[PDB]
Design a protein around this ligand. Sequence first.
Ligand code: HEM
Length: 282
Amino acid sequence: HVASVEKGRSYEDFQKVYNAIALKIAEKKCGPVLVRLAWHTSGTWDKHDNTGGSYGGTYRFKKEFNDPSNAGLQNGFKFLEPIHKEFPWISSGDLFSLGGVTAVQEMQGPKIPWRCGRVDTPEDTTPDNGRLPDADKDADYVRTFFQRLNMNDREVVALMGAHALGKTHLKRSGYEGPFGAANNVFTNEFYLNLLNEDWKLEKNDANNEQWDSKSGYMMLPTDYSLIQDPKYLSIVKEYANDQDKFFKDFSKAFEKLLENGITFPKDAPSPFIFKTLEEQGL
Ligand code: HEM
């Protein structure tokens, strides 16, 4: 899949799209669902045959937006609709991925370089449901799962830190509760809370197991597996003790996730680094 720049567009065009998304996030407090949308639209990728991935923007098709794994992301899509209406020239893959970048940055997360040029592909290119991960599994599951995305242990642990941004909803996923204290702010608190809170393995009202802290947080079985495996645990401790290292590693892993499957020509533009609304005085 060769990246092809939307005709005649440059950094300033994409900064205008960024800003419109950023204003929407401030308006609706929809940062977390847009991060999740960027991840799910990218996370269908299979390194073995280059199916799925962010390039084709196939979430716009029924099979994918109706994936049970994507329950709730329709809200994010809906919030992007006015942006795509104002900027109809941007491809769907570019919009979904840029939505995630914008959301991380606007929630005071790291800068995430972003490259344009994803191109819409037809409905028959939509990947089947079942490529996104299960939450009821263990560290071995997680490690194996993420090999299909070409992610190693450090990349996995870093990416999972995005959980502290938001919450689980029983009706959507079968899990209920906030993942952290810092709702709508990107921090390293996922790691700190895993190490420092008092966690109990309980059943929620959907009869699924989750880990609950007295402070009112929860963790999925796959989240908690990062302190049950000794290789993951050492990285959890590293990020709990170095906010900057976490931010830099997250940025790299998230850009990689959003770019898997895409061939950027040698004369493609460099990755863009968008200014936040705060940085622009907006
Ligand atoms: C083993 C991997 C992971 C699994 C099993 C998992 C599963 C889940 C589940 C079940 C939810 C709750 C959905 C809901 O009820 O609304 C969720 C929420 C979330 N996921 Fe993950 N996730 C994984 C990895 C990731 C990664 C890699 C990212 C992005 C870097 C991410 C970002 C988020 C965000 C931001 C939310 C919060 C959504 C909200 O607040 O509405 N997840 N995840």
